[PDB]
Design an enzyme around this catalytic site. Structure first.
Site, PDB file in Angstrom:
ATOM      1  N   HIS A 249       0.737  -1.118  -0.034  1.00 26.97           N
ATOM      2  CA  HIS A 249      -0.102   0.151   0.016  1.00 26.97           C
ATOM      3  C   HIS A 249       0.926   1.097   0.111  1.00 26.97           C
ATOM      4  CE1 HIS A 249      -3.596   2.367   1.562  1.00 26.97           C
ATOM      5  NE2 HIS A 249      -2.628   3.209   1.593  1.00 26.97           N
ATOM      6  N   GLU A 250       1.839   1.264   0.993  1.00 27.07           N
ATOM      7  CA  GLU A 250       2.670   2.597   1.062  1.00 27.07           C
ATOM      8  C   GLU A 250       3.705   2.909  -0.099  1.00 27.07           C
ATOM      9  OE1 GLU A 250       1.959   4.674   3.242  1.00 27.07           O
ATOM     10  OE2 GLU A 250       0.357   3.365   4.078  1.00 27.07           O
ATOM     11  N   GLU A 284      -5.932   8.293  -1.632  1.00 28.71           N
ATOM     12  CA  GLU A 284      -6.195   7.190  -0.703  1.00 28.71           C
ATOM     13  C   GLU A 284      -7.277   6.365  -1.285  1.00 28.71           C
ATOM     14  OE1 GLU A 284      -4.450   5.875   1.464  1.00 28.71           O
ATOM     15  OE2 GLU A 284      -5.704   4.540   2.556  1.00 28.71           O
TER      16      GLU A 284
HETATM   17 ZN   LIG Z   1      -2.854   5.060   2.219  1.00 28.17          ZN
END
Ligand SMILES: [Zn+2]
Ligand SMILES: [Ca+2]
Length: 441
Positions: A249-250, A284
């Protein structure tokens, strides 16, 4: 070469001398360097400052540190939990019965074990291979050019890290002998963060507001030895977040920082209304799961397209303070400076590869085709956490309960049980398979 591991150990000696006539910085894999961090004062307001740190190059352009950088106080007492777990002791002194040296050695071994898992997944999945080839090797062009950087320099503060030696007399690590191509830097959560935080940041930012299309290497604050629980769907089936998915994710935010498409801001330096959907940034939702935008995939894809359109074209508002400069105008303005100037083939190819543009030898100018710059932005959002989770069969949030402790230890080095395998990764996300932390409050 994708995620090929260099022969580098925790105890591999730091570079102390460099002779350019017989040695190459490409062969240097343990060295003192410096990266920007946000530092916080007693009030808790942030300024960007360089911090020295020891780097290990574990693979071409991928660096890790065991150093917990001093970014100021967290403002939370040791061993207090507020969803996230705070301890000043983690990787600064004895913690959970482990010496500082033990913790640093384990952090190094644990990050390498995670990347060995990713290498095995690259061999299995075209999509994962494509992702790592991109974030490990892609050209990264930042602008405007800073300080003493020439307009035709390939390596600068946006895409390389300094190699520092010690001044013999003062012992200060401030003798720069060159720089090394950098795409990814992985470090522990700094002093200001909880030990359970995972956070991706632009590796380098100039003093101004950031420009869409201006890339940098990314820094991830990450520690695979801790994770947090999560609740299923909207039932009560609880499990542990897989750190290997948390880092993916990061690193997806990372790819967005590499292209300068992660953090659109207006002329006031605030996130525009069109970049948010209480409030969650589009950055996000596109990193997490496209499907969270709308239940209908085609509506999700349309709202995604509208957002990418504004990243690409920017937006003019009736209040000019709320206008956004897009990737196309920023990149074309930057490259248009080179019109009619002789440039090296190396710098030409660097730019061509970065933005997917061509060069007109006759007029000595970059050909900045709109379709190519649109593809540059679109390509940045080709994969998300949910796709990784499906390929790897990792459980994650579909996305405040009073279900007790949030924060767990993760036995990455298999001291308790067969917990983490280089082929299979985390062998169980069940909470009874992991050790709960014991917050004082
Ligand atoms: Zn995130
Ligand atoms: Ca978090």
């Amino acid at each position: 070469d994708v995620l090929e591991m260099f022969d580098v150990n925790y105890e591999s000696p730091i570079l102390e001398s460099f002779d350019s006539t017989t040695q190459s910085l490409n062969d240097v894999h343990v060295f003192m360097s410096r990266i920007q961090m946000s530092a916080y004062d007693a009030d808790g307001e942030g300024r960007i400052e360089y911090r020295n740190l020891k780097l290990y190059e574990i693979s071409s352009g991928i660096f890790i540190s065991t150093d917990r950088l001093d970014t100021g106080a967290s403002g939370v007492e040791d061993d207090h939990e507020m969803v996230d777990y705070y301890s000043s002791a983690r990787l600064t002194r004895e913690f959970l019965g482990e010496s500082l040296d033990s913790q640093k050695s384990d952090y190094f071994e644990g990050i390498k074990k995670v990347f060995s898992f990713y290498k095995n997944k690259c061999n299995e999945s075209r999509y994962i291979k494509e992702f790592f080839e991109e974030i490990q090797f892609r050209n990264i062009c930042g602008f405007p050019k800073q300080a003493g950087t020439s307009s035709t320099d390939i390596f600068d503060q946006f895409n390389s890290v300094d190699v520092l030696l010690q001044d013999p007399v003062t012992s200060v690590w401030n003798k720069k002998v060159g720089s090394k191509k950098a795409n990814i830097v992985i470090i522990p959560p700094a002093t200001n963060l909880p030990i359970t935080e995972a956070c991706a940041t632009a590796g380098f930012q100039p003093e101004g507001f950031p420009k869409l299309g201006s890339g940098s290497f990314f820094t991830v604050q990450f520690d695979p030895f801790f994770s947090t629980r999560f609740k299923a769907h909207e039932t009560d089936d609880v499990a542990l977040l897989d750190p290997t998915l948390t880092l993916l994710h990061e690193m997806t935010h990372g790819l967005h920082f590499q292209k300068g498409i992660a953090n659109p801001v207006n002329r006031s330096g605030e996130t525009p209304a069109w970049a948010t959907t209480k409030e969650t940034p589009m950055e996000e939702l596109l990193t997490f799961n496209k499907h969270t935008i709308d239940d209908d995939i085609e509506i999700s894809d349309h709202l995604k397209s509208t957002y990418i359109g504004f990243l690409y074209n920017g937006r003019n508002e009736d209040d000019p303070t709320e206008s956004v400069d897009g990737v196309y105008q920023n990149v074309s303005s930057f490259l248009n400076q080179y019109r009619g100037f002789e440039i090296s083939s190396d710098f030409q190819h660097f730019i061509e590869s970065c933005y997917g543009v061509k060069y007109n030898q006759e007029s000595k100018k970059f050909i900045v085709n709109p379709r190519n710059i649109k593809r540059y932005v679109q390509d940045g959002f080709f994969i998300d956490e949910a796709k990784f989770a499906r390929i790897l069969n990792i459980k994650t949030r579909s996305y405040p309960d009073n279900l007790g402790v949030w924060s767990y230890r993760v036995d990455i080095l298999n001291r308790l049980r067969e917990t983490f395998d280089e082929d299979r990764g985390l062998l169980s996300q069940e909470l009874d398979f992991h050790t709960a932390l014991t917050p004082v409050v």
